Write a protein that holds these residues in place. Structure first.
Motif, PDB file in Angstrom:
ATOM      1  N   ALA E  48     -12.831  77.266   1.446  1.00  0.00           N
ATOM      2  CA  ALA E  48     -13.763  77.759   0.440  1.00  0.00           C
ATOM      3  C   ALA E  48     -13.139  77.621  -0.942  1.00  0.00           C
ATOM      4  CB  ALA E  48     -14.158  79.216   0.701  1.00  0.00           C
ATOM      5  N   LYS E  49     -14.002  77.615  -1.955  1.00  0.00           N
ATOM      6  CA  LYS E  49     -13.598  77.280  -3.312  1.00  0.00           C
ATOM      7  C   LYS E  49     -12.950  78.469  -4.020  1.00  0.00           C
ATOM      8  CE  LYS E  49     -18.271  78.081  -5.173  1.00  0.00           C
ATOM      9  NZ  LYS E  49     -19.411  77.451  -5.887  1.00  0.00           N
ATOM     10  N   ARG E  50     -12.287  78.158  -5.132  1.00  0.00           N
ATOM     11  CA  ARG E  50     -11.605  79.138  -5.961  1.00  0.00           C
ATOM     12  C   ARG E  50     -12.608  79.917  -6.812  1.00  0.00           C
ATOM     13  NH1 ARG E  50      -8.459  81.237  -3.877  1.00  0.00           N
ATOM     14  NH2 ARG E  50      -7.807  79.163  -3.168  1.00  0.00           N
ATOM     15  N   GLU E  51     -12.199  81.125  -7.210  1.00  0.00           N
ATOM     16  CA  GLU E  51     -12.968  82.065  -8.029  1.00  0.00           C
ATOM     17  C   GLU E  51     -14.176  82.654  -7.309  1.00  0.00           C
ATOM     18  OE1 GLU E  51     -13.866  80.724 -12.009  1.00  0.00           O
ATOM     19  OE2 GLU E  51     -12.378  79.115 -11.894  1.00  0.00           O
ATOM     20  N   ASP E  52     -14.306  82.448  -6.000  1.00  0.00           N
ATOM     21  CA  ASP E  52     -15.442  82.974  -5.256  1.00  0.00           C
ATOM     22  C   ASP E  52     -15.195  84.437  -4.900  1.00  0.00           C
ATOM     23  OD1 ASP E  52     -17.805  83.222  -3.887  1.00  0.00           O
ATOM     24  OD2 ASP E  52     -17.305  81.791  -2.301  1.00  0.00           O
ATOM     25  N   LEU E  53     -16.197  85.279  -5.156  1.00  0.00           N
ATOM     26  CA  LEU E  53     -16.040  86.717  -4.968  1.00  0.00           C
ATOM     27  C   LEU E  53     -15.948  87.090  -3.489  1.00  0.00           C
ATOM     28  CD1 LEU E  53     -16.003  89.477  -6.509  1.00  0.00           C
ATOM     29  CD2 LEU E  53     -18.450  89.495  -6.304  1.00  0.00           C
ATOM     30  N   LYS E  54     -16.793  86.482  -2.650  1.00  0.00           N
ATOM     31  CA  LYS E  54     -16.791  86.833  -1.232  1.00  0.00           C
ATOM     32  C   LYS E  54     -15.478  86.453  -0.559  1.00  0.00           C
ATOM     33  CE  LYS E  54     -20.498  84.359  -0.371  1.00  0.00           C
ATOM     34  NZ  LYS E  54     -21.634  83.631   0.216  1.00  0.00           N
ATOM     35  N   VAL E  55     -14.810  85.407  -1.048  1.00  0.00           N
ATOM     36  CA  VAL E  55     -13.499  85.043  -0.516  1.00  0.00           C
ATOM     37  C   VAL E  55     -12.511  86.182  -0.737  1.00  0.00           C
ATOM     38  CG1 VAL E  55     -11.545  83.473  -0.828  1.00  0.00           C
ATOM     39  CG2 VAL E  55     -13.838  82.556  -0.670  1.00  0.00           C
ATOM     40  N   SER E  56     -12.485  86.729  -1.952  1.00  0.00           N
ATOM     41  CA  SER E  56     -11.581  87.832  -2.249  1.00  0.00           C
ATOM     42  C   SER E  56     -11.933  89.076  -1.442  1.00  0.00           C
ATOM     43  CB  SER E  56     -11.596  88.135  -3.745  1.00  0.00           C
ATOM     44  OG  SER E  56     -12.785  88.787  -4.139  1.00  0.00           O
ATOM     45  N   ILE E  57     -13.228  89.351  -1.263  1.00  0.00           N
ATOM     46  CA  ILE E  57     -13.628  90.523  -0.481  1.00  0.00           C
ATOM     47  C   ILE E  57     -13.142  90.385   0.964  1.00  0.00           C
ATOM     48  CG2 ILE E  57     -15.564  91.926   0.308  1.00  0.00           C
ATOM     49  CD1 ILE E  57     -17.065  91.034  -2.279  1.00  0.00           C
ATOM     50  N   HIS E  58     -13.327  89.201   1.553  1.00  0.00           N
ATOM     51  CA  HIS E  58     -12.831  88.966   2.906  1.00  0.00           C
ATOM     52  C   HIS E  58     -11.311  89.097   2.970  1.00  0.00           C
ATOM     53  CE1 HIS E  58     -16.861  87.218   3.778  1.00  0.00           C
ATOM     54  NE2 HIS E  58     -16.566  87.536   5.024  1.00  0.00           N
ATOM     55  N   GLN E  59     -10.603  88.576   1.961  1.00  0.00           N
ATOM     56  CA  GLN E  59      -9.143  88.679   1.950  1.00  0.00           C
ATOM     57  C   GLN E  59      -8.684  90.132   1.903  1.00  0.00           C
ATOM     58  OE1 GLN E  59      -8.345  85.982  -1.369  1.00  0.00           O
ATOM     59  NE2 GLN E  59      -7.378  84.540   0.044  1.00  0.00           N
ATOM     60  N   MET E  60      -9.368  90.965   1.120  1.00  0.00           N
ATOM     61  CA  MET E  60      -9.031  92.386   1.074  1.00  0.00           C
ATOM     62  C   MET E  60      -9.241  93.052   2.431  1.00  0.00           C
ATOM     63  SD  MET E  60     -10.239  93.650  -2.711  1.00  0.00           S
ATOM     64  CE  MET E  60      -9.392  95.206  -2.525  1.00  0.00           C
ATOM     65  N   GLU E  61     -10.371  92.757   3.083  1.00  0.00           N
ATOM     66  CA  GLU E  61     -10.614  93.352   4.396  1.00  0.00           C
ATOM     67  C   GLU E  61      -9.561  92.904   5.409  1.00  0.00           C
ATOM     68  OE1 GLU E  61     -13.196  92.173   7.352  1.00  0.00           O
ATOM     69  OE2 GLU E  61     -13.668  94.212   7.979  1.00  0.00           O
ATOM     70  N   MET E  62      -9.156  91.637   5.329  1.00  0.00           N
ATOM     71  CA  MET E  62      -8.110  91.124   6.205  1.00  0.00           C
ATOM     72  C   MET E  62      -6.782  91.819   5.956  1.00  0.00           C
ATOM     73  SD  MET E  62      -8.809  87.088   6.110  1.00  0.00           S
ATOM     74  CE  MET E  62      -7.539  86.718   7.288  1.00  0.00           C
ATOM     75  N   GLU E  63      -6.450  92.063   4.685  1.00  0.00           N
ATOM     76  CA  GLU E  63      -5.242  92.815   4.355  1.00  0.00           C
ATOM     77  C   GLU E  63      -5.244  94.167   5.046  1.00  0.00           C
ATOM     78  OE1 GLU E  63      -4.744  93.161   0.049  1.00  0.00           O
ATOM     79  OE2 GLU E  63      -2.851  92.077   0.283  1.00  0.00           O
ATOM     80  N   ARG E  64      -6.392  94.843   5.032  1.00  0.00           N
ATOM     81  CA  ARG E  64      -6.476  96.160   5.661  1.00  0.00           C
ATOM     82  C   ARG E  64      -6.259  96.081   7.176  1.00  0.00           C
ATOM     83  NH1 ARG E  64      -8.326 100.096   2.414  1.00  0.00           N
ATOM     84  NH2 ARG E  64      -9.333 101.211   4.125  1.00  0.00           N
TER      85      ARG E  64
END
Lengths: 162, 527, 176, 194, 203, 196
Positions: E48-64
């Motif tokens: 997936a591409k850079r600066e995408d909001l849903k990518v960051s949201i998924h990454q945060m959930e994965m961190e948890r």
């Protein structure tokens, strides 16, 4: 007794009694030594000290502020009481016996009593100085190094006696 | 496979092992391991990471050079390298260790707060010389049969008596006129006939008139275990001897595998598997020792000619030129005389391939040599008097006296700053005579554990480098190449030899086989 | 368990935000969220809400229980009862800290809300202290703590449990 | 999570933990005994030690030598566990100094119970009631002394009580750091000092 | 098992392992499935591409999710390292049918840990000690887990006739009933099968 | 009295409850082992006398020395084990390559044990996932923000963040980087997380 030490006078420089003098752990006899480089450095130090009064009282490296050292002394005093280690005590014992023999022979060679006596209170004074040195480090025991430093400081007082 | 996948797994392996790679390091790794298949990549990476961990890393961050060296450890010189089996170590190259008394162990100079040695020593260093000599002998002595009672020992156990050492500060006072007391201390005269004993706690005058000497060469500045009693400000000796010796096996049994001797190895040479398996195939090594090699006169070059003639069969692994190369140290003549004669020696030894390509020609100058005088450890002579030899005989070295040779499985000390007659001429009561003289000399040097067991004005030493003259732990071979007659003897499974003054002694060089652990008592008058 | 871990579990609670961005439904492992339409309410976990507030991407609404009259009624009920009363959230203290520290601009009467939640916290910690003291004094072997929250337990529970372990061994040392 | 934790003390249980430094130090403390048989060669430490001789020796050694019929030696309680001092504890547990009288008061007292003394019941009840009496003040001082000098509070506590006190302090400081927001920061570990 | 429910069971295991004094029975299905979810989501997000909001949201959930899993495994490894002779003895003596307290990986780690520790102790001191003293059994040296620890719990399924045992005297024992949603402070040994069966949740 | 030397080791470790590792007391361990040797030799002589000579009164002294031997063994094992606990904690507290000033405190056998423990832990972490494992040394605190702002405390070199990109860790420079990348360096004191 004569203002300056007046080195020819020797024991006549002291009017204190042996009773009061034996109660002092250390007796630093202080003589103002006239050396030229010492005097130049001392004068430059004094002049800089007087000059620097306006410098806003800035902090300094490698030393403790008085307000902090006061608290540190209080903390160490209330917290730490050291003791002598065994080998350290052996070192102190033997050195004390040597110093006592030296003092006796000095008084015998002089055929006169020295104003500063070397007594069991001076033994205990060396013990106290070693314990103070350890208390600076908050160590429960005083080592041979501490006893050696205590004896080094005390041998200035023994120089002052002999 | 994809290079990004290889990078990912390499980084993951190092990261799970707790290590971070620099960018250049991971770039090197991810191109070096392109030949590796998926069936073996993790095994390869674990091999590499273990190899990396062998080094003394200062950080969790890994540099390019460390990964390179690990891959080299994995692929090349993994079994051995050729130059480990023999090396030559100057006196100034020896590492320094300090004996911590309260930990009761030797610590490195890098670990203690002690200052680094320099030639112009401080006032503290001059004291530390003799204090450290005492320290080594003290710790060694207390671990011999003079050890603790023990305090658990009871009376039925420890029914037999045992010695207990005292320092000089203890014998004054109520300890006066006790029946039996033994003190470790240095023996020295205040004035002729005014003998005294000294240790770091004090000094005391000696009445040694009744002393039973234990048959050694007791000089000034030797350390002794004087046994007697104290009275009237004098210590009255009953018996008088050296402190006992220790073998190096016992020394290592106490202090571990530490490399006291020198060289690049962290452990001693004889305590690592690489050397332990190389010594199986190094069977045919051989060394030659030679002193009073007066090559400035061409008579000695004639002797070198017949040496090469005699020992061209079975080429020597090395020759030892024991300094004093000047028979005519008159002045400036000797410098160019030595340069010309060393040119001549190089020219003659160029005549062969085998000795020229195998034998190490190592030179250790002494007093009668150019440059620095009779001040120890003797530095090497001037490089302008060595370069022409070196450039056409690369298998040669010019180094200090004393000097240390580490073999694949043995350790040797070479020394020629002459002292046998010095030992004989200043004994406290008397020397011990006849053919026993060399045995008493080696007993003295071994028990004292220092190549100069005699005063500084008798044998000057640079103060801060006095540790380099130490004979503790005991070497496997001790070559003391004095002007005195040649000899061979042994004590505490140490071999000890003098190759002697070759011109006077009927041309008696000596040759040593380390792999066989033996020497030839040769005499080349018959060549 | 740390207070930060208790906060981590509190962060899973759902709160309503008003996005200023458009985003389709996102299918997180712990359950799908959205769609996010600008200007409309949408319910999301608290960690996501706080992150979006920090990144200026939404307006947070107070939960239904963050009202001054409701909190005053709950506080007075807590002060009157002897047992722990049911709390408006199982992580009300953590919710209060997070929401009021990051979104006081959005939440009116935040000072009153914080003071009332502090009152409830003080009352319930006092009740917990009474419970611990009664347990040790009467030598209980069991207690009922139905309406306590995880942060409230975790504040004192390690100390209390260690003390009760020692007490049990002291009262059973004669067993053999 | 993965911080260092020593082996926990087992001194209140039927037997102490083998690897516990606290239990080792506790069992080093000396216990009065009387020898019921003579011990050859032992007069070097205290010739034989005669029969019927009074001694004070470590608790570990007394437990090793003791048996239920008292062949080697018989055991006396220390005076702090006898009926005189039990009454002082019964008066008010909060004013006694278990650091002087211990510092392992409860652990040592629990281990005395294995010598089959007739007053084991009284000792056990005394230890339990001393703990019950001192619990509230340990709890209050531990959980309400914040960011101040706790030495005055900790001075008269025995080692078990001091462990509990540090636990309460840990809980207090953890919650206070969370409330002040200092729990968020990632920090270098305690080994960063060197 | 829905992915949301999987993460919920992971949290349940996390808290139970936090508060239980002993090493609880392994949840290999939980660990394997959570790791599968994390690897799959990494695969999704790397494409997936850079600066995408849903990518960051998924990454945060994965961190948890990654944090809970790592903390749970760390706690289990702490328990294994603390009680390594006893968990190994339990695994060796385990009958056929009850679950293991160790995964195969944890068991390999435990065996390696015990061998390493015994080798160190022997080499350093216990080969030097006299011949009959050279063997310490770490099964007796290391302490056992203390099952009489007090724990807080919340109960998920109703239980009846749970026996509280205050002290030595059996006359003072008495039964209680655990209502769903209630919270209790109780000795662990009285509730350990309930923790195993999931009827109660330690807090 | 016996076993007093054994207490010095125990007291040395006990008076550092913070978990710092003191220098290994090689000579203290040596002295207690020699005490055990003396105890054992005396007991061998006494038990031989009691059995072969039939002398019965030595039995209490036999039991005395045997108990003392057991005590010395307990103290030695407990000392070494608690040192192992501290060393084990160091891997998680700091990292894999311990600082040299701390490595000099460790025994050679302690370093061997620590290397074996590191290798075994790496194996366990590697075996968790489908491939490349799970580094459970990471994520020691619950995640708050995906990116953090960090400040360089030491003059480190370069530190890669992507395949082709790196940051120069020069002192007082500030970087805004992923938390999972910065966590180990923050733990080791190279970086400082600078929002609170």
């Amino acid at each position: 007794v004569f203002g300056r030490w007046d080195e020819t006078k020797g024991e006549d420089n002291i009017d204190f009694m042996p009773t009061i003098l034996s109660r002092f752990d250390m007796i630093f006899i202080v003589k103002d030594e006239h050396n030229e480089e010492r005097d130049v450095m001392l004068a430059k130090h004094v002049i800089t000290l007087h000059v620097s009064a306006l410098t806003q009282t800035q902090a300094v490296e490698g030393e403790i502020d008085l307000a902090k050292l006061k608290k540190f002394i209080a903390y160490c005093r209330v917290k730490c009481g050291p003791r002598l280690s065994a080998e350290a005590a052996e070192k102190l014992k033997n050195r004390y016996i040597i110093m006592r023999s030296g003092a006796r022979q000095h008084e015998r060679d002089s055929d006169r009593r020295s104003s500063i006596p070397i007594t069991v209170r001076q033994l205990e004074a060396i013990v106290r100085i070693a314990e103070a040195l350890s208390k600076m480090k908050l160590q429960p025991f005083a080592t041979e190094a501490d006893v050696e430093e205590a004896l080094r400081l005390f041998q200035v007082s023994t120089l002052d006696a002999a | 496979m994809a290079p990004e996948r290889l990078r990912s797994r390499a980084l993951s392996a190092f990261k799970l092992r707790g290590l971070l790679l620099r960018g250049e390091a991971i770039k090197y790794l991810t191109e070096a391991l392109q030949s590796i298949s998926e069936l073996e990549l993790e095994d390869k990476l674990e091999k590499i990471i273990n190899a990396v961990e062998k080094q003394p890393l200062s950080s969790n961050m890994i540099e390019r050079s460390v990964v390179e060296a690990a891959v080299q450890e994995c692929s090349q010189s993994v079994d051995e390298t050729i130059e480990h089996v023999f090396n030559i170590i100057g006196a100034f190259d020896i590492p320094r260790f300090v004996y911590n008394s309260e930990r009761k162990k030797f610590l490195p100079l890098l670990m203690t707060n002690h200052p680094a040695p320099n030639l112009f020593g401080t006032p503290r260093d001059k004291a530390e010389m003799f204090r450290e000599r005492y320290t080594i002998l003290h710790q060694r002595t207390h671990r011999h049969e003079l050890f603790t009672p023990p305090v658990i020992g009871s009376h039925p156990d420890e029914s037999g008596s045992k010695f207990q050492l005292k320092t000089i500060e203890t014998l004054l006072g109520s300890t006066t006129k006790i029946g039996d007391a033994i003190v470790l201390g240095m023996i020295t005269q205040l004035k002729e006939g005014k003998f005294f004993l000294e240790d770091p706690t004090g000094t005391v005058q000696l009445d040694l008139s009744k002393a039973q000497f234990h048959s050694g060469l007791y000089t000034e500045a030797c350390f002794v275990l004087a046994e007697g009693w104290f009275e009237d400000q004098v210590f009255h000796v009953n018996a008088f001897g050296f402190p006992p010796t220790e073998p190096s096996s016992t020394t290592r049994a106490y202090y571990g595998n530490i490399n006291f001797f020198g060289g690049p190895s962290n452990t001693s040479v004889k305590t690592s598997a690489k050397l332990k398996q190389l010594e199986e195939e190094n069977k045919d090594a051989m060394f030659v020792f030679l002193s009073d090699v007066w090559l400035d006169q061409v008579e000695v070059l004639e002797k070198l000619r017949i040496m090469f003639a005699g020992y061209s069969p079975a080429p020597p692994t090395c020759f030892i030129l024991c300094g004093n190369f000047s028979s005519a140290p008159y002045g400036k003549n000797q410098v160019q005389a030595l340069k010309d004669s060393l040119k001549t020696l190089a020219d003659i030894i160029c005549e062969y391939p085998d000795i020229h390509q195998s034998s190490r020609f190592v030179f250790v100058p002494g007093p009668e040599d150019p440059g620095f005088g009779s001040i120890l450890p003797r530095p090497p002579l001037a490089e302008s008097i060595t370069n022409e030899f070196r450039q056409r005989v690369p298998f040669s070295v010019f180094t200090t006296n004393p000097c240390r040779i580490q073999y694949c499985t043995q350790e040797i000390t070479v020394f020629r700053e002459d002292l046998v007659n010095k030992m004989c001429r200043n004994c406290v009561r008397f020397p011990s005579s006849n053919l026993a003289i060399p045995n008493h000399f080696v007993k003295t040097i071994l028990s004292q554990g220092h190549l100069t067991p005699l005063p500084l004005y008798v044998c000057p030493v640079y103060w801060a480098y006095d540790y380099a003259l130490r004979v503790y732990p005991v070497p496997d071979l001790l070559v003391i190449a004095d002007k005195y007659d040649p000899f061979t003897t042994t004590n505490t499974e140490c071999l000890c030899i003098n190759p002697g003054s070759f011109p006077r002694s009927g041309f008696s060089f000596k040759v040593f086989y380390p792999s066989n652990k033996t020497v030839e008592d040769s005499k080349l008058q018959g060549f | 368990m740390d207070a930060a871990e208790v906060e981590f579990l509190a962060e899973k609670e759902l709160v309503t935000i008003i996005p200023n961005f458009s985003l389709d439904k996102i299918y997180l492992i712990g359950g799908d969220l959205g769609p996010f339409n600008p200007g409309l309410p949408v319910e999301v976990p608290l960690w996501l809400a706080i992150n979006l507030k920090q990144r200026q991407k939404c307006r947070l609404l107070p939960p239904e229980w963050m009202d001054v009259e409701k909190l005053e009624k709950m506080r007075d009920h807590e002060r009157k009862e002897e047992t722990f009363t049911p709390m408006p959230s199982p992580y009300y203290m953590e919710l209060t800290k997070l929401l009021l520290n990051h979104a006081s601009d959005n939440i009116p009467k935040a000072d009153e809300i914080r003071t009332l939640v502090k009152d409830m916290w003080d009352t319930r910690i006092a009740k917990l202290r009474v419970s611990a003291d009664s347990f040790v004094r009467q030598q209980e072997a069991h207690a009922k703590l139905d309406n306590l929250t995880l942060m409230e337990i975790n504040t004192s529970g390690t100390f209390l449990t260690q003390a009760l372990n020692h007490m049990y061994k002291l009262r059973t040392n004669l067993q053999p | 999570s993965e911080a260092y934790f020593r082996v926990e003390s087992g001194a209140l249980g039927p037997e102490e933990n083998f690897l516990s430094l606290d239990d080792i130090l506790m069992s080093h403390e000396k216990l009065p005994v009387r020898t019921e048989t003579a011990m050859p060669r032992l007069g070097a430490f205290f010739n034989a030690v005669p029969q019927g001789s009074k001694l004070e020796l470590p608790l570990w050694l007394a437990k090793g030598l003791f048996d239920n019929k008292r062949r080697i030696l018989s055991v006396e309680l220390p005076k702090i566990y006898q009926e005189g001092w039990r009454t002082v504890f019964s008066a008010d547990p909060n004013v006694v100094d278990l650091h002087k009288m211990g510092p392992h008061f409860y652990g040592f007292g629990s281990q005395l119970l294995h010598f089959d003394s007739p007053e084991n019941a009284d000792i056990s009840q005394s230890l339990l009631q001393t703990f019950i009496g001192r619990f509230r003040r340990i709890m209050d001082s531990s959980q309400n002394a914040y960011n101040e000098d706790t030495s005055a509070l900790v001075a008269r506590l025995d080692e078990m009580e001091r462990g509990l006190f540090q636990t309460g302090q840990k809980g207090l400081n953890d919650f206070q750091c969370w409330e002040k927001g200092q729990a968020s920061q990632i920090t270098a570990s305690n080994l960063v000092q060197n | 098992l829905t992915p949301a429910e999987l993460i919920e069971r992971l949290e349940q295991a996390w808290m139970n392992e936090k508060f239980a004094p002993e090493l609880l029975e392994s949840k290999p299905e939980i660990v394997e499935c959570v790791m599968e979810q994390l690897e799959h989501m990494e695969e999704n997000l790397r494409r997936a591409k850079r600066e995408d909001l849903k990518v960051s949201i998924h990454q945060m959930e994965m961190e948890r999710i990654r944090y809970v899993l790592s903390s749970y495994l760390r706690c289990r490894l702490m328990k294994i390292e603390k009680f390594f002779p006893h968990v190994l003895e339990k695994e060796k003596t385990r009958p056929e049918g009850e679950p293991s307290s160790l995964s195969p990986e944890e068991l390999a780690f435990a065996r390696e840990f015990m061998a390493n520790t015994e080798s160190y102790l022997k080499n350093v001191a216990l080969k030097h000690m006299p011949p009959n003293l050279q063997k310490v059994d770490l099964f007796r040296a290391v302490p056992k887990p203390d099952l009489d620890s007090y724990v807080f719990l919340r109960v998920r399924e109703r239980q009846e006739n749970i026996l509280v045992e205050p002290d030595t005297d059996e006359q003072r024992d008495y039964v209680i009933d655990l209502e769903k949603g209630s919270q209790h402070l109780i000795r662990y040994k009285t509730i350990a099968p309930l923790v195993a069966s999931g009827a109660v949740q330690l807090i | 009295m016996f076993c007093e030397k054994a207490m010095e080791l125990i007291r040395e470790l006990h008076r550092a409850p913070e978990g710092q590792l003191p220098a290994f007391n090689e000579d203290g361990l040596r002295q207690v082992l020699e005490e055990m040797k003396a105890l054992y030799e005396q007991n061998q002589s006494d038990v031989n006398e009691a059995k072969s000579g039939g002398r019965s009164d030595l039995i209490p002294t036999i039991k005395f020395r045997h108990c003392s031997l057991l005590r010395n063994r307990r103290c030695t094992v407990a000392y070494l084990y608690d040192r192992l606990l501290r060393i084990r904690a160091l891997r998680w507290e700091y990292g894999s390559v311990l600082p040299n000033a701390l490595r000099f405190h460790m025994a050679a056998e302690e370093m061997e044990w620590f290397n074996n423990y590191k290798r075994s832990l790496a194996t366990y972490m590697r075996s968790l996932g489908g491939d490349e494992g799970l580094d459970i040394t990471q994520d020691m605190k619950p995640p708050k923000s995906l990116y953090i702002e960090v400040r360089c405390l030491k003059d480190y070199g370069e530190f890669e963040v992507d395949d082709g990109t790196s940051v120069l860790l020069k002192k007082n420079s500030q970087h805004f980087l992923p938390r999972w990348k910065c966590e180990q360096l923050i733990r080791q004191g190279v970086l400082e997380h600078i929002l609170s």
